[PDB]
Amino acid sequence: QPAPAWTTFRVGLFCGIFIVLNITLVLAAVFKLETDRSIWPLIRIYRGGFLLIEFLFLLGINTYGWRQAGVNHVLIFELNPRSNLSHQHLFEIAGFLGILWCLSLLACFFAPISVIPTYVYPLALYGFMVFFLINPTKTFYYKSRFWLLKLLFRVFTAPFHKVGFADFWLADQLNSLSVILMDLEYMICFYSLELKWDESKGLLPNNSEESGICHKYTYGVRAIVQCIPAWLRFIQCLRRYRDTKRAFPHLVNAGKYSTTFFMVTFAALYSTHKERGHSDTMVFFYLWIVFYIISSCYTLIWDLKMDWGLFDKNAGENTFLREEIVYPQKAYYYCAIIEDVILRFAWTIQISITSTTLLPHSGDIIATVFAPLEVFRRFVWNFFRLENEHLNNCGE
Amino acid sequence: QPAPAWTTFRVGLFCGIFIVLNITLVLAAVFKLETDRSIWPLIRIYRGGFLLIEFLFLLGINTYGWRQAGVNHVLIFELNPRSNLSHQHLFEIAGFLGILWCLSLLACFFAPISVIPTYVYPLALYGFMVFFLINPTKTFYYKSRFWLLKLLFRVFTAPFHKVGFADFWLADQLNSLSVILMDLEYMICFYSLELKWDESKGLLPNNSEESGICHKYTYGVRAIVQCIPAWLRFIQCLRRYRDTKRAFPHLVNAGKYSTTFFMVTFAALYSTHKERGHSDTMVFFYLWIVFYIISSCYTLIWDLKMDWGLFDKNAGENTFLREEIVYPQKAYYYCAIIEDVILRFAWTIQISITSTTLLPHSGDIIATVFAPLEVFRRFVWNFFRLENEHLNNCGE
């Protein structure tokens, strides 16, 4: 059914304010923001909000495509039929949050008037976001936030509860968005140990030895945060095997989800080896690279054959595809297959350097540049995973 | 007729961009625009565009009101029943012109760099508006622009063509937009006579005797371009009387529009005598105030009694209104009566102030404040005029 003009009008209003705010923010950054002050902490803090906004927009795009293409995704997610969110609500929420993020960033830039210089705005934005998430009144999409909160509870306690479709789906979407988790941990570390709260001005050049502790792994504060979603999904799959006792897919997935654990622990060992400067440290490079290959070359084989279900023996006229395809043009299929193999390697590299403390001056730049790319990889992955599930359900 | 969601999205986008541009323009004006330079030429240049944008938005509100309340404008305007322009398109055009106007004003405020320092943006904006109006392509509401141009041609040569509803309605609307003509004339004079076109800057001191040449009226075309709309409507009503052979309504109406001729000529005569310091100059004042009252107290009885059909003897239970009404709240009618009575005086005050060059310091300011009020008065007027026309058509 066509949505009322109020919803669409709100979507457009928020989109336009968002666009103009982005342009004026770029102009202010290029012109007003002096380069001498380091601005890396600001980006490291606001990257999480940007990623969340982008993910919400992209999810709106996927649900649009799902309704257009004929995928019966309400039954697949086992949603409530009479109360569902279409693309416009997701667009409106994303635009609203983007307006707030842009306003907070602009305030941090200019600092119009206050006595505490700039370190209230990020806390305020994140506090309002979490308040929106857990607001107990019956307004602003109460059902959807209730369902999401219950499902988050189920996912983070998954080794105990039964696992369903939306459980592991949001488990993966958390696996791609781990950047927000490490950003939150770094923000807590910075606000706890580094910043002079009982002072003025704020950020200043760091010359002391104690500076840069949050850049270090200390004991495990960096690697464990990285592998947390891997642990969640690993334990979910183990439990699914335990209830089901079906060998092939459930036991195979454990290895795929444990390869990242092996890669992360090897990266941490290499970090401590550069700290020690051992003679064999260079040799430890090779193993990492090996387990880099063994990582990517694993999940790739899983992506095309098991996730998306390509390379069917009954391909027929559909070259390098399955017998039955719902999307009209094979061009998107081939484009996605091409770009996924490119983006997976960058994702693994990003995970490695965001916890290994490598490339000291360019590592965070690397993290920034390929942070909003695995999200697009997952945005592509969603379409084909859900359509494969729809045809699998249709077959049986 | 549910419009497509894209139209509503564009309306929202343009509204949001317009709001943010207005806010940043206000901020830049209070902060960045230094006050040493005389700025009144900028206001006298951009006032025409502002008034046109405002009039277009208010017409959108008017047509939405007619459609919702039951005022059947399609039959009376003689528009094609199957091709009509809804209020959302009027909102779109108003927002588009407003965004362009805001961008041009901001550029004139800043003017990053060029070969021509700052005075290309006004001609650029007005030329864009004209090329939009007279574009011969079959795009951008290819019926509305052509219909408006044809009606403008019919109105501007009124004493020759037959007179229908749309002709006199647009003539009445034009009666409230003489400020556009005054602004256009002043801009032409400034860019033709005084401005050093082959030069730079544009902030020459105003204390020189050479300044304010276009503010003078000794040549006497200011008054004529002022009363041009009055002449158009007067000769139109005279032609209507000639064609109809009915003295009462058309002839009294013609006298009504005739009074402003005496208004303007007496105002100009006082101005000339006062500059010459003629002994009995205040004598020329006296008749003026008389021709003040006999003007306003004239048009009022046309607006309240004949235009709207109020104060009817056969009203019945609805005291001080007509017998039948369509709008629910009498507070609307009473507030409209009070506001019409209040603003009918300010309209003639503004006319005399603009065409007489009195109050050398406060005249421009008071004209600026009273300009966006008689257009709102006309906006209020259309409601009840079209409702009375619909009642007349239904009854007979």
mmCIF file of C-alpha atoms in Angstrom, chain A residues 5 8-9 11-13 15-17 20-21, chain B residues 5 8-9 11-13 15-17 20-21:
data_model
loop_
_atom_site.group_PDB
_atom_site.id
_atom_site.type_symbol
_atom_site.label_atom_id
_atom_site.label_comp_id
_atom_site.label_asym_id
_atom_site.label_seq_id
_atom_site.Cartn_x
_atom_site.Cartn_y
_atom_site.Cartn_z
ATOM 1 C CA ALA A 5 2.610 11.809 1.949
ATOM 2 C CA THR A 8 7.734 10.601 2.245
ATOM 3 C CA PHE A 9 7.817 14.331 2.962
ATOM 4 C CA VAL A 11 12.134 11.419 4.391
ATOM 5 C CA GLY A 12 12.875 14.142 1.851
ATOM 6 C CA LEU A 13 13.130 16.920 4.431
ATOM 7 C CA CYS A 15 17.623 13.950 3.327
ATOM 8 C CA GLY A 16 17.937 17.551 2.153
ATOM 9 C CA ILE A 17 18.996 18.874 5.540
ATOM 10 C CA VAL A 20 23.358 20.591 2.928
ATOM 11 C CA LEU A 21 24.823 19.907 6.378
ATOM 12 C CA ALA B 5 5.896 9.862 -3.836
ATOM 13 C CA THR B 8 6.417 14.840 -2.195
ATOM 14 C CA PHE B 9 10.060 13.834 -1.771
ATOM 15 C CA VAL B 11 8.927 19.125 -2.003
ATOM 16 C CA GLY B 12 10.533 17.931 1.225
ATOM 17 C CA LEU B 13 14.050 18.154 -0.198
ATOM 18 C CA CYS B 15 11.882 22.769 1.811
ATOM 19 C CA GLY B 16 14.781 21.435 3.879
ATOM 20 C CA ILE B 17 17.443 22.987 1.663
ATOM 21 C CA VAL B 20 19.001 25.535 6.064
ATOM 22 C CA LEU B 21 20.033 28.087 3.433
#
